[PDB]
Amino acid sequence: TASTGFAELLKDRREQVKMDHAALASLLGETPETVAAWENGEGGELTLTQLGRIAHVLGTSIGALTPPAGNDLDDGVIIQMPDERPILKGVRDNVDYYVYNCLVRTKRAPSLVPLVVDVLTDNPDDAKFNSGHAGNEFLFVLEGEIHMKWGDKENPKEALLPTGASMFVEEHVPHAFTAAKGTGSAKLIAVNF
Amino acid sequence: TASTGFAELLKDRREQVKMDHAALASLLGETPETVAAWENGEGGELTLTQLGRIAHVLGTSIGALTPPAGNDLDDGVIIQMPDERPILKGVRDNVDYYVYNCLVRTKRAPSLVPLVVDVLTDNPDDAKFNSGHAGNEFLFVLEGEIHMKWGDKENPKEALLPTGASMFVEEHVPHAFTAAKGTGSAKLIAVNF
Amino acid sequence: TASTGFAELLKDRREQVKMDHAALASLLGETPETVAAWENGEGGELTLTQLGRIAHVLGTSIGALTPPAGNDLDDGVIIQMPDERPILKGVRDNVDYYVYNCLVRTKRAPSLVPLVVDVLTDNPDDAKFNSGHAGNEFLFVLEGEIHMKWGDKEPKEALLPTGASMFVEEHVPHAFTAAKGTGSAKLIAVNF
Amino acid sequence: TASTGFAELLKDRREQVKMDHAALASLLGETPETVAAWENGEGGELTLTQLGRIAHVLGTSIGALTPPAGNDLDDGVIIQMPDERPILKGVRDNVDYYVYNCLVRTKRAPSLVPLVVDVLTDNPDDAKFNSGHAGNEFLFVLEGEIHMKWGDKEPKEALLPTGASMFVEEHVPHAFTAAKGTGSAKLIAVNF
Ligand SMILES: [Fe+2]
Ligand SMILES: [Fe+2]
Ligand SMILES: [Fe+2]
Ligand SMILES: [Fe+2]
């Protein structure tokens, strides 16, 4: 399938830039008999570095030469039940500070990463700024109060987000947060898209 | 500002397609003295139908000739407090069936429409299928249980989404929902993006 | 239509953001009957400044509320004959320096602007220089020798013989004339 | 590098989806030390089928995990001389029918494929016919008269004199030869 996608896209690119199995095979340094096979679905074992070259000689990226993520939907929908949520914990010196509960995700939209974040630290100073995402983010406060921080990791703007507050964080905009001072814990839904 | 954006974009388009104030003015049927002014920021009062023509003669859309939505962010973020949420009610014969609570929205990402939907009907048959959105949707069950319906408005797939369930609805995929049978009401967060 | 296109797109945006006729009308300082009319194809007279504000309250752009360029094709294609082509003169002091021949253009791809540029100046120092555009550009030398100048007035220079082709990335400023004392040159430039 | 590019992009995707070395390793039936190595630039030998599965568990594509085409420019531009151009022959029975001259191409825009096509067939019935491509195409008649055929073998036909230009939308199938008995024609085609 990844092999079949490569086959169709290799052939198409080869054709759009006017190269016969001969030229491509030469330019790359293989036997026309080889490229032929690649286009016959036999690319399976080619390596990431080999694909690197093949894409070069064709003035393109490996991405243009490989099939799209795929379709994991059922009539346009995909459902995640709470009992099948993957869980990861942000621990520090063996103590939970955050727990990320991963919600439904789909290959038909890879930028979509929805999480339920349980914040187990109510000390604003424990907030550790993270560079910034390569995509926008939607936030929603489920429980407690959230002390949000954003901007210059050194000199940052602050906000006290009570339950029910919603926020929008532009991509590449650095941010960090804990639960409001002395309130114990908080809960927010974060949707990176 | 909408007038200033039009000015810069009118001039740029005019130039990229090689037309002097003369040709454009003729082709459109105005005085070169007029187009000149338009490009001087004086387009303000032009009508939607006039802009329609101007964009035609330049082989483009009014969209390419008008500035982008704008920037309403504060250092890459925008915050909506719960007390400023706009509320709309889906009523039927004077009785609330749904209440939409609008969450933060931003011009820097117009496709983003997050809502908290209180479903006040627990009768699956009241589910009224809506064509489908021109964008994807992320759903999350906040309270109660949701009886989701999707696909053929006539013969549809059904799902019983307990609290904590998350769902993904591809765009143009028709859907509708009520709270699970006899449970009174439910709550879900819907994020159209 | 601009009118019908607005009508359809306005209703969708409004319904999309959970605003009823009145909510929208309130924010706009209009009456709900007015808005309803707009969604009934009567927005034709709305000005650019009004649309600007409508888009603002709907948290989007005028473009997102207006219809696409349109379609001028014919089974996926459009053809322009050498007769039906506009001609623009890049004139200085009545002295023709550049003469652009506009090739086929289409709404289905507004960004495509193909041209045959006759350069009537063989004085490299006459190279005016623009500040690049928000599009890429492909060039091909048809006749003569081209004197290419890119980067920014201060710049790399190339003498392109006939049959030469080059790619100029968006926002990269450029200028050109025909090679020193050769009189004139010709090149086709396709901005996309 | 493909290796380094993978390394950087894999780590971001993993961190992006809240998977630690072990979680990823579990789904892949690999060990956490392996994955860590990959994020350390040692993914070079991973096959296309393996990358395919890695992308699958990371709910994305191989492309989203691999680096962009790369950059071959030079201050926003790249130049090709008539000497440095590849030539491909569309041959049938040793009889040259079409000869394509490849013009300047760039990774910064892979989709751009400019060509000078010498058509050595004046027999319209020789018009082969392709099934359109996933890109748009601009054409210009350099020499001779072109016999255009579009739609699908069953089709609109146009006789393009010299200087004619046309736009062919993506997926719209086309074919062509030189006008009846005129020997040969020339046209530049730029797919983008
Ligand atoms: Fe984040
Ligand atoms: Fe919906
Ligand atoms: Fe240019
Ligand atoms: Fe073609």
From Swiss-Prot, chains C, D:
MF terms (GO), sorted A to Z: dioxygenase activity; DNA binding; DNA-binding transcription factor activity; ferrous iron binding; oxidoreductase activity, acting on paired donors, with oxidation of a pair of donors resulting in the reduction of molecular oxygen to two molecules of water
Binding-site residues, Fe cation: 133, 137, 174
Enzyme class label: oxidoreductase
SUPFAM superfamilies tied to this protein: lambda repressor-like DNA-binding domains (SSF47413), RmlC-like cupins (SSF51182)
Necessary cofactors: Fe(2+)
DNA-binding region per Swiss-Prot/TrEMBL record: 21-40
Any matching Pfam family: Cupin_2
EC number: 1.11.1.23
Catalytically driven reaction(s): (S)-2-hydroxypropylphosphonate + H2O2 = (1R,2S)-epoxypropylphosphonate + 2 H2O
InterPro entries: Bact_TransReg_Diox, Cro/C1-type_HTH, Cupin_2, Lambda_DNA-bd_dom_sf, RmlC-like_jellyroll, RmlC_Cupin_sf
Other known facts: Phosphinothricin tripeptide (PTT) herbicide and fosfomycin antibiotic biosynthesis pathways share early steps starting with phosphoenolpyruvate before the pathways diverge after formation of 2-hydroxyethylphosphonate (HEP). HppE is involved in fosfomycin biosynthesis after divergence of the 2 pathways.
Protein's recorded name: (S)-2-hydroxypropylphosphonic acid epoxidase
